């Protein structure tokens, strides 16, 4: 059985008949050790991509890198469901999302880069009662702007010139 | 960045076009990316294979470009239908659809042109200076339950008023702004007060 | 057999007869709308070439195709996050419910979040999440919002609509007692406050029975959440097809680059290598195109869900059959793994009873018209009753207005109008 | 219009066509004139050659050399000309002619 | 470098070693005439359509 | 990030610059223990021959 992966101890067991094991969609999942008869599960080692979080060259040049779905042990490091974040410091404070990282974690520039759980808003328990009403005594008259595309550039290419000229 | 959406569309076009032209400098496994050089070095029987190599890649790139252009045109057409609906409803009339014509009780919208789109200036009514009052579903007077004709039964702690639901204008409780249905034994939150009749003093 | 469209009912139409309902069947219909698809990404270099350096030295003479593909998938994922934001992140000042749930007799315990810590969801949300259920250079990005925060958005919207009504969708959440908001929603659907206030106890048992039936229906049938399951299965099947295309020769000797590089001299092994390259490129391009088309469909569905949340949940829609069949009263949002479930509360008249009518009533040669209702007759006496509920209200001058004389109007019926 | 509409009734509107090849007037060639025919017999028919174990590279540059006389000669057999063709060598201009 | 176009008088400045300057999609845009050393801009001829 | 975006300046956000993949380290082969080792040796060391 040829391949690469992390060969961990497994609780699930094959039959004494069966020697190999596949996962759903026909991928190797566990194999019984031929030397000593026990079944070791396989989990291929991490290959998640790496991304860069930046506030912009206008503000600073500091960089925070996210290695997706990789433990920080497998190269300040902050472990997140999205992945391992390096260069950003976790904070217990909550702020509105600035640079979305994922799984509720967002980063921002505050000197350095700080990562946190996004605050969904200000928790406001309405003073509800079965004989209490709130009536406005004024108004605002608010003018907002709503931008909507209606068309694009009317491009037109000719295949002959593009392909042959 | 306020017009970023529009900018996005422009970028999504321009970048695509650039990508297309950048596909003209790709060998695709051919000896070069210039047809004239290939025809000027190789014999046409053997240059045919290289021309095929170029043509296959360029045609695939062109088909991909047209496919993504069609998808972008579909999304832009959806946006244009949305804009036409908003011009028909927000601008040409007053819309009762919530948060369609901006946030708040929409009053009226003003259209403005933009290089490849429209900008709606939504003037909407947002009421904000709140006051709490003690409230009644109904008012008991001579066992009639006196429900409010058009407003809400608010109270200053002590006295009661029939105000409109979006601006505190108290007004006294009279038979003209109040209508009667049944007696005071069915309504859960009935509150006992006096409703004023104008006609009797008018005598 | 030849299908029948239904029962060939023939309404008892007449030029003077009406059917005025005398009761109601307050109901909770259910609607499920997909709002997002699985945020996936593909490493085109790793996908097409594995780890071989020779294929990586190719796929660049093919140009920026990989950049196109990963840009399209990244745009799709960002669009999924935007969809989830538009559907759910529509409310400011995340709200809370009072510790005392005295909502006029109504019972939202099944939709309100429970402290027993299933995430922070509710009973109905738990049932919905129970019902519907890397490798080769393709990964799944986690959604920006986690299910707990989506449930928190849901709870905030539910608390705002329970306590404030539609006010929290315009400005600050003006608190108003429940069964008083619903009376005003009746005012919105035509019937007066009398119906609710005199039927307050009945219109809490009707709603609770409807909620219980929704609970039972969601628990019972596995195909209740068919739309979200279809979305998940479609995404999974597209991914599985993309994976299984790897084990395809595509006109080459093998589907594994190592074997080709082993048993052939590289100058002519190049033919098999780029045959596999073209095959995998075509498979990936097809996957991306179908993902974009399905993402357009999901975006349409998510815009529909956002529009419904704005109009149904945050208001009272006068649009017919938009927020459920019947006269829409108010809606409730619930979260599901990749979608939103609306609990459209609607009013349905039922229990009809026919009377005979008249366009106007002739008194003193003046042709009185009804101010806000219909003229009906008990066969002997005439009454002015509202158009969606039987309530006699004997005819007076207060609820009728005069428009001339009893000559032009066709269906004039002679009668008397009382004078207060 | 009616040939591309595959019909004889055309109705109103606008209909398109294909390449607008504006034919370029005449043909211009701007090869540099060194005014020095390149002595190419320096390499082919000259004194004794080297050995394969120590092969020597010769250079011809800053000159106007013609391959047509080479190809037309029947003595010069065994041509392959990888990457180009003998008939099209003439119009090509080069700089690094490693012999 | 074969091809058709209009050879306008160029205004860009060249390194005394640079021969021909390209643009995006590596299309020959400017060229030095080997004799009477100067810069010329190659611009594609009218290819609109009818 | 500048190189992949092909722009000298970059804006606030997150950009997937490249891909990380763990390198395999050593290699292992496991086969059924010991052997079915033949009585071949008795042929080479037989007494009655
Ligand atoms: C409603 O709000 C407006 C402002 O939004 C109030 O008008 C302000 O009144 C103060 C003093 O009365 C002035 O100093 C401000 O200049 C006013 N602002 C504007 C924009 O006119 C208004 O008084 C409020 N309504 C009530 C009933 O008090
Ligand atoms: C209840 O609301 C009424 C409405 O104004 C208030 O009654 C009047 O208050 C003014 C002073 O602002 C007095 O001059 C009048 O004599 C009051 N009219 C009465 C008592 O009939 C009253 O102040 C409010 N009660 C509160 C705020 O507790
Ligand atoms: C509002 O509901 C509460 C209980 O459901 C009631 O009012 C409270 O009643 C308790 C005891 O029953 C008292 O201790 C509180 O002081 C009361 N508070 C208020 C504000 O009344 C009552 O059933 C309901 N009130 C109305 C007006 O319907
Ligand atoms: C109306 O005000 C009175 C004041 O106590 C209350 O109802 C009265 O109850 C007594 C017996 O407890 C009866 O004899 C009176 O006839 C009632 N008054 C009426 C019917 O007007 C009660 O506070 C109020 N009624 C409500 C709120 O329904
Ligand atoms: C209107 O319909 C409701 C049911 O939709 C009726 O309520 C039922 O009434 C019967 C007899 O009064 C009871 O036995 C049931 O338990 C009631 N059901 C519920 C859910 O409350 C109601 O009576 C009808 N109204 C009229 C005037 O007939
Ligand atoms: C609202 O409905 C729920 C479920 O129908 C009720 O929860 C029940 O609570 C009582 C005791 O508190 C018990 O019957 C069970 O523990 C719960 N489930 C069921 C199915 O009964 C809840 O009590 C209702 N709300 C009110 C105010 O009664
Ligand atoms: C239709 O309804 C009217 C209104 O109730 C009925 O007229 C009343 O009938 C009852 C007994 O049948 C009398 O006690 C009332 O005095 C009548 N009201 C009057 C005369 O104003 C009428 O009988 C009904 N018609 C039917 C049932 O066919
Ligand atoms: C509804 O239609 C009936 C049917 O024509 C009308 O009743 C007729 O009335 C005229 C006099 O008004 C009589 O001469 C006819 O004999 C009646 N027809 C029948 C079949 O009896 C009635 O007037 C119409 N009502 C309205 C409001 O349009
Ligand atoms: C109103 O009642 C009378 C029958 O009693 C009818 O209308 C009368 O018509 C005559 C002339 O045709 C007039 O002189 C009377 O003044 C009318 N009476 C009125 C207006 O009360 C007719 O049947 C009835 N009107 C209807 C049914 O529309
Ligand atoms: C070989 O040297 C001669 C110079 O004398 C040239 O080629 C000769 O060409 C004439 C007629 O064109 C022939 O009759 C001779 O036989 C050729 N000489 C040969 C073949 O050796 C030319 O300079 C040289 N040939 C090359 C460079 O191909
Ligand atoms: C491989 O060899 C080992 C020992 O030579 C065998 O495992 C031993 O089993 C006994 C009893 O089951 C244990 O007390 C020893 O500790 C084990 N040895 C080791 C090194 O763990 C094993 O069975 C052999 N594999 C086979 C025969 O397939
Ligand atoms: C059984 O035969 C084997 C194979 O020949 C013998 O193994 C070797 O035998 C030679 C000669 O007898 C010795 O010199 C070697 O040292 C042996 N090798 C080992 C690893 O022991 C084996 O000795 C024979 N058994 C006997 C003779 O009893
Ligand atoms: C003007 C006024 O009375 N406002 C109060 C507000 O201060 C309070 O926080 C809440 C009721 O508890 O709403 C109301
Ligand atoms: C439900 C109900 O009471 N319907 C009545 C019934 O008396 C009548 O027969 C029917 C038409 O046939 O329409 C009306
Ligand atoms: C971004 O740069 C501009 C000038 O290019 C500057 O005016 C602006 O303040 C900058 N934004 C910051 C520093 O946040
Ligand atoms: C690293 O991966 C996961 C993520 O924290 C963790 O559970 C696992 O134990 C770690 N692997 C180690 C310590 O080898
Ligand atoms: C706050 O942050 C510190 C350091 O990051 C951490 O140890 C702690 O658990 C966090 N929470 C609280 C409540 O202190
Ligand atoms: C308004 O809210 C405050 C806050 O507790 C309360 O003290 C006051 O009694 C309320 N007013 C009315 C009229 O209910
Ligand atoms: C209701 O309609 C039926 C027709 O099926 C009719 O017979 C009946 O008389 C109508 N009811 C009244 C009160 O007229
Ligand atoms: C080469 O061409 C140049 C063009 O400017 C010319 O001046 C020169 O005389 C030519 N050399 C000759 C004819 O030997």
Give the rounded distance of the alpha carbon of A51 from its chain centre. Answer: 10
Between CA C171 and CA C245 the distance in angstroms is 54
Tell me if C121 sits within 8 A of C113, measured CB to CB: yes
Tell me if C43 sits within 8 A of C137, measured CB to CB: yes
Tell me if C42 sits within 8 A of C67, measured CB to CB: no
Token pair for A41: 């599960």
Between CA A133 and CA C162 the distance in angstroms is 13
Which of E7, E46, E50 lies closest to D17 in CB terms? Answer: E50
Between CA C26 and CA C44 the distance in angstroms is 55
Sheet holding A77-79, edge to edge: A77-79, A83-86, A64-68, A49-56, F11-19
CB contact under 8 A, C46 and F19: yes
The closest of C12, C6, C31, C142 to C81, measured between CA atoms, is C142
User: B24 alpha carbon to ligand 17 midpoint, in Å?
Assistant: 56
CB contact under 8 A, B41 and D83: yes
Q: How many CB atoms lie within 10 A of CB C80?
A: 24
Residues on chain A touching F32 (C-beta within 8 angstroms): 34-35
The closest of C348, C324, C325, C328 to C25, measured between CA atoms, is C348
Q: What is the largest CA-CA distance in chain A?
A: 84
* Residue with CA nearest ligand 19 atom 5: C12
Cα distances (Å, whole numbers) of residue B143 to B147, C175, C272, C378, C385: 12, 29, 94, 27, 22
Q: How many CB atoms lie within 10 A of CB B174?
A: 13
The closest of A52, A46, A101 to A73, measured between CA atoms, is A46
Cα distances (Å, whole numbers) of residue C169 to B100, C93, C111, E17: 12, 11, 20, 69
How many distinct helices (H) and strands (E) make up chain D?
Answer: 1, 0
Contacts of F48 (CB under 8 A, 6+ apart): none
Residues on chain A touching D19 (C-beta within 8 angstroms): 158, 160-161
* Residue with CA nearest ligand 10 atom 21: D45
Between CA C185 and CA A116 the distance in angstroms is 41
Q: How many CB atoms lie within 10 A of CB C95?
A: 26
**Header resolution in angstroms:** 3.4
> What residues line ligand 8, using a CB cutoff of 6 Å?
C 15-16, 410-411
CB contact under 8 A, A144 and B9: no
Residues 40-69 of B with CB under 8 A from E: 40
Between CA C32 and CA C334 the distance in angstroms is 9
Beta bridge partners of A56: F11
Q: What is the CA radius of gyration of chain E?
A: 12
The closest of B142, B148, B149, B87 to B120, measured between CA atoms, is B87
Q: Where do the H-state alpha helices sit in chain F? A: 2-5, 41-44
Which of C93, C97, C137 lies closest to A122 in CB terms? Answer: C93
Q: Is C385 left (phi over 0), alpha (psi -120 to 50) or beta?
A: beta
Tell me if C367 sits within 8 A of C400, measured CB to CB: no
Written as one string, the DSSP assignment of A19-84 is -EEEETTTEEEEEE-SSS--EEEEEPPP--EEEEEEEETTT----EEEEET--TT---EEE-SSEE
Angle between helices B44-86 and C266-308 (to 10 degrees): 10
> In chain E, which ranges are E strands?
6-9, 20-22, 28-32, 39-43
The closest of C343, C345, C341, C344 to C35, measured between CA atoms, is C341
Torsion, Cα C280 C285 C291 C293, to 10 degrees, reads -150
Select the residue from B37, B40, B47 to test the D interface by mutation, using most D Cβ atoms within 10 A: B40
- Please give the DSSP secondary-structure letter assigned to residue B154: E
Cα distances (Å, whole numbers) of residue B126 to A134, A136, B108, B130: 14, 10, 13, 12
Tell me if C89 sits within 8 A of A118, measured CB to CB: no
Between CA A22 and CA B195 the distance in angstroms is 82
Between CA D13 and CA C80 the distance in angstroms is 41
* Residue with CA nearest ligand 12 atom 2: F41
Beta bridge partners of C28: C345
Per-position b or e across A74-85, b if 16+ CB within 10 A of its CB = eeeebebebbbb
Q: Is the Cα torsion angle C268, C269, C270, C273 positive or negative in sign? A: positive
Q: Is the Cα torsion angle A39, A44, A46, A48 positive or negative in sign? A: negative
- Please give the DSSP secondary-structure letter assigned to residue B101: S
Between CA B34 and CA C393 the distance in angstroms is 90
CB contact under 8 A, B128 and C172: yes
Torsion, Cα D90 D91 D92 D98, to 10 degrees, reads 20
Question: Percentages helix, strand, coil for chain E, rounded to the nearest 5?
Answer: 5, 35, 60
Which of B27, B74, B187 lies closest to C197 in CB terms? Answer: B187
- Please give the DSSP secondary-structure letter assigned to residue C143: P
Beta bridge partners of B195: none
The closest of B95, B107, B101, B105 to B126, measured between CA atoms, is B105
Between CA C291 and CA C283 the distance in angstroms is 12
Written as one string, the DSSP assignment of A112-160 is -EEEEEPP----EE----TTEEEEES----EEEEEEEE---------HH
Q: What is the CA radius of gyration of chain F?
A: 31
* Phi and psi at residue B106, to the nearest 5°: -65, 135
CA distance B35 to chain D (A): 14
F32 and chain A in contact, CB less than 8 A: yes
């Amino acid at each position: 059985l040829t391949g690469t992966g992390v060969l961990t101890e497994s609780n699930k067991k094959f039959l004494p008949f069966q020697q190999f094991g596949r996962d759903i969609a026909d991928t190797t999942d566990a194999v019984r050790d031929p030397q000593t008869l026990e079944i070791l599960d396989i989990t291929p080692c991490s290959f998640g991509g790496v991304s860069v979080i930046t506030p912009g060259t206008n503000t600073s040049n500091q960089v925070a890198v996210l290695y997706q779905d990789v433990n920080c042990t497998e190269v300040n490091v902050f472990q997140t469901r999205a992945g391992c974040l390096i260069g950003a410091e976790h904070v217990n404070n909550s702020y509105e999302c600035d640079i979305p990282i994922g799984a509720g974690i967002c980063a921002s520039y505050q000197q350095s880069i700080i990562a946190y759980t996004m605050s969904l808003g200000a928790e406001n328990s309405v003073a509800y009662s079965n004989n209490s009403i709130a009536i406005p005594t004024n108004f605002t008259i608010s003018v907002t702007t709503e931008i909507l595309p209606v068309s694009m550039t009317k491009t037109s290419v000719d295949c002959t010139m593009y392909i042959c000229g | 960045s306020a017009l970023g959406k529009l900018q996005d569309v422009v970028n999504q076009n321009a970048q695509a076009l650039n990508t297309l032209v950048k596909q003209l400098s790709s060998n695709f496994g051919a000896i070069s990316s210039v047809l004239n050089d290939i025809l000027s070095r190789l014999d046409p029987p053997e240059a045919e294979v290289q021309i095929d190599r170029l043509i296959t890649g360029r045609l695939q790139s062109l088909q991909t470009y047209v496919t993504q252009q069609l998808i972008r045109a579909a999304e832009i057409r959806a946006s244009a239908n949305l804009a036409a609906t908003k011009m028909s409803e927000c601008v040409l009339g007053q819309s009762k659809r919530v948060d369609f014509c901006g946030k708040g009780y929409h009053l009226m919208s003003f259209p403005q042109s933009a290089p490849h789109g429209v900008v709606f200036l939504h003037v909407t009514y947002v009421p904000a200076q709140e006051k709490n009052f003690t409230t009644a579903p109904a008012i008991c007077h001579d066992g009639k339950a006196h429900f409010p004709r058009e407003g809400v039964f608010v109270s200053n702690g002590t006295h009661w008023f029939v105000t409109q639901r979006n601006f505190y204008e108290p007004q006294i409780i009279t038979t003209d702004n109040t209508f009667v249905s049944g007696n005071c034994d069915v309504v859960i939150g009935i509150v006992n007060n006096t409703v004023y009749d104008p006609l009797q003093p008018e005598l | 057999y030849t299908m029948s469209l239904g029962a060939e009912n023939s309404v008892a139409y007449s030029n003077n007869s009406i059917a005025i309902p005398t009761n109601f069947t307050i109901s909770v219909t259910t609607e499920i709308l997909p709002v997002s698809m699985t945020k996936t990404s593909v490493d085109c270099t790793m996908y097409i070439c594995g780890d071989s350096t020779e294929c990586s030295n190719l796929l660049l003479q093919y140009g920026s195709f990989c950049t196109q593909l990963n840009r399209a998938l990244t745009g799709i994922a960002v669009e999924q996050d935007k969809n989830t934001q538009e559907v759910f992140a529509q409310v400011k000042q995340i709200y809370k419910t009072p510790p005392i749930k005295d909502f006029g007799g109504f019972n939202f315990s099944q939709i309100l979040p429970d402290p027993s810590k299933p995430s922070k969801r509710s009973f109905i949300e738990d049932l919905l999440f129970n019902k519907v259920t890397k490798f080769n250079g393709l990964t799944v990005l986690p959604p920006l919002l986690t299910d707990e925060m989506i449930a928190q958005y849901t709870s905030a919207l539910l608390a705002g609509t329970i306590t404030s009504g539609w006010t929290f969708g315009a400005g600050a959440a003006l608190q108003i007692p429940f069964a008083m908001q619903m009376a005003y929603r009746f005012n919105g659907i035509g019937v007066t406050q009398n119906v609710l206030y005199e039927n307050q106890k009945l219109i809490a048992n009707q709603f609770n029975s409807a909620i219980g039936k929704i609970q039972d229906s969601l628990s019972s049938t596995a195909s209740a959440l068919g739309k979200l399951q279809d979305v998940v299965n479609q995404n999974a099947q597209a991914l599985n097809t993309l994976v299984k295309q790897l084990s395809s020769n595509f006109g080459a000797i093998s589907s594994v680059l190592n074997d080709i590089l082993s048993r052939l001299d590289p100058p002519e092994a190049e033919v098999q290598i780029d045959r596999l390259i073209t095959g995998r490129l075509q498979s990936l391009q097809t996957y991306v195109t179908q993902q974009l088309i399905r993402a357009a469909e999901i975006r349409a569905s998510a815009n529909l869900a956002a529009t419904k949340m704005s109009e149904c949940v945050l208001g009272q829609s006068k649009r017919v059959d938009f927020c459920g069949k019947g006269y829409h009263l108010m809606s409730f949002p619930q979260s599901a793994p990749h979608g939103v479930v609306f609990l459209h509360v609607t009013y349905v008249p039922a229990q009809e009873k026919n009377f005979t009518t008249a366009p106007a009533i002739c008194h003193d040669g003046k042709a009185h018209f009804p101010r806000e209702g219909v003229f009906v007759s008990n066969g002997t006496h005439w009454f002015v009753t509202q158009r969606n509920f039987y309530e006699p209200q004997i005819i007076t001058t207060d609820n009728t207005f005069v428009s001339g004389n009893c000559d032009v109007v066709i269906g004039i019926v002679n009668n008397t109008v009382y004078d207060p | 219009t009616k040939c591309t509409l595959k019909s004889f009734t055309v109705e109103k509107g606008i209909y398109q066509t294909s390449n607008f090849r504006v034919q370029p007037t005449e043909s211009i060639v701007r090869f540099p004139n060194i005014t020095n025919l390149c002595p190419f017999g320096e390499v082919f028919n000259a004194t004794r050659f080297a050995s394969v174990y120590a092969w020597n590279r010769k250079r011809i540059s800053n000159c106007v050399a013609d391959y047509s006389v080479l190809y037309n000669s029947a003595s010069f057999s065994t041509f392959k000309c990888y990457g180009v063709s003998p008939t099209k060598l003439n119009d090509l201009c080069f700089t690094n002619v490693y012999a």
